[PDB]
């Protein structure tokens with residue numbers, strides 16, 4: 001037992017982190033097969049960052065302008081291209097540590113592990129959630145761009161995030177592995193504001209199911225509600241609306257505890273309208289929203 | 305910026321996890337060089353677990369009773385011995401993925417990363433602290449015994465923990481890699497209670513410095529306290545006392561933020577006496593004590 005914010009084992013991703021340098025700018029890249037993926041602003045200097053014309057800047061670069069390094073070992077760049085905000089550098093060596101992998105674009109509310117790297121060296125790993133406003137409350141410093149977030153299913157690594165930016169409020173922004181930003185953010189040296197954040201409702205429900213599994217069930221009530229009425233109230237309490245996918249992935253926890261999704265939604269609606277009244281859930285007095293139903297299933301059943 | 309519970313990258317440890325089976329019991333082992341380390345209760349049956357005479361049980365086993373598996377590859381056991389609660393199985397193959405490593409015993413208040421594994425397959429990694437009562441607030445299920453905790457210094461892995469047991473309260477217990485339990489716990493199948501736990505004060509102070517570095521400073525005040533008066537109040541609230549060494553290691557964070565240590569201690573004393581008033585610090589409604597000063601420095605610099 002015990003419930004912890006848990007990250008995936010990072011070895012498979014560690015085996016793929018490299019160091020990409022253009023001129024004096026050094027950030028991190030992802031070496032899969034014979035291709036290295038990294039943020040394109042590696043080709044920028046400071047004066048270019050303020051308003052960059054990445055096409056014009058890339059036409060001026062050649063293969064021999066890119067220094068790719070695994071450790072201190074150079075990988076020769078034999079091709080280069082730009083896909084949205086991601087630079088793809090074809091190298092001369094296929095990574096022998098390439099795992100089975102996919103590129104996926106996650107939805108707001110999903111979690112993933114971030115491998116914080118600097119100069120191609122992994123420094124840390126932590127668990128993160130894509131907020132409803134398409135930011136992440138990560139932990140990044142200078143030189144962390146190109147660090148990736150990922151999940152692992154069986155032995156297959158699904159890469160979903162590449163880091164690019166820190167907003168003035170201290171949250172972070174990035175793209176998928178196809179270079180498309182999450183949210184309305186652009187890779188420019190500008191102070192950009194995110195929309196107002198909200199609470200991830202499906203994750204709070206997953207946490208309440210985790211409570212019921214461990215005996216904590218004072219918050220259950222008689223009532224049920226329709227999905228639409230619940231979403232209407234939830235938006236009034238700065239909670240995200242619940243999608244059909246959300247109801248579907250809550251299915252296993254509903255079957256394990258015997259509590260239907262809409263019944264638990266009525267329980268949470270009562271919690272939002274009346275409060276907690278001093279009482280606690282899993283010790284905590286705050287409702288936790290960065291555990292997905294998958295995370296609860298993973299820690300309350302064991303997976304891989 | 306930002307602050308998260310961060311674990312060390314686990315790849316070097318993943319390269320060493322194997323599956324150890326004796327009879328019907330299967331748990332995890334650590335394969336370093338030509339030796340596999342695992343919890344000794346792998347040799348016990350449900351009958352033995354109540355009051356196991358481990359040396360009698362071990363002398364009755366042979367090399368061929370132990371099935372060591374690296375993924376889908378059998379490792380032939382050519383020796384076996386016992387160091388306290390840890391069984392050491394000598395195999396015929398040296399692990400090529402063996403990193404530079406050390407066996408260390410950590411003190412209460414220190415943190416480490418846990419690689420939770422089942423049947424030799426790593427499933428998760430998270431950050432833990434050795435509680436003052438020598439438990440850890442981990443996340444372990446059946447078959448997780450043999451999972452290890454560790455830190456990493458440049459490229460050297462310091463193994464400090466091997467998991468053995470879950471207490472009735474849901475906290476966890478284990479040994480160092482020399483087989484000596486942390487705390488008054490025993491590897492037998494009984495309900496075992498821990499001593500009263502206290503809060504790691506120096507860690508709370510480091511985490512308040514982390515909160516100041518990341519903008520949160522509603523809890524600060526214009527007051528200052530002496531070390532002894534702060535320790536009086538802290539012990540009143542079941543907090544471990546703050547030593548001069550603790551004050552010194554907070555030095556870098558004090559220099560970075562410009563807040564003296566005793567100034568922050570006045571802030572924390574006000575927090576303990578008054579409460580949070582519904583407010584939060586770094587998204588937490590409770591005072592966090594599982595970040596050492598070094599963890600904060602490493603993350604905020």
Ligand SMILES: *C(=N)[C@H](C[C@@H]1CCNC1=O)NC(=O)[C@H](CC1CC1)NC(=O)c1cc2c(OC)cccc2[nH]1
Nearest residue numbers: 140141142143144145164165166187188189190191
């Ligand atoms: C990549 N190495 C780096 C990582 C940042 C720095 C601190 N922690 C992080 O997460 N990324 C950047 O520095 C990016 C680069 C631009 C292409 C996006 N810039 C920012 O994150 C950035 C720039 C500003 C700014 O510029 C005037 C004003 C306010 C905030 C801000 N953030």
Ligand SMILES: *C(=N)[C@H](C[C@@H]1CCNC1=O)NC(=O)[C@H](CC1CC1)NC(=O)c1cc2c(OC)cccc2[nH]1
Nearest residue numbers: 444445446447448449468469470491492493494495
């Ligand atoms: C190892 N695979 C396993 C890991 C446990 C199971 C549940 N989660 C964990 O962390 N360890 C055990 O099962 C140990 C074995 C000990 C003999 C060394 N046993 C316990 O943790 C245990 C036994 C009891 C008990 O027995 C009557 C009563 C209450 C609690 C308890 N915990």
Ligand code: NA
Nearest residue numbers: 525527567570
């Ligand atoms: Na003060």
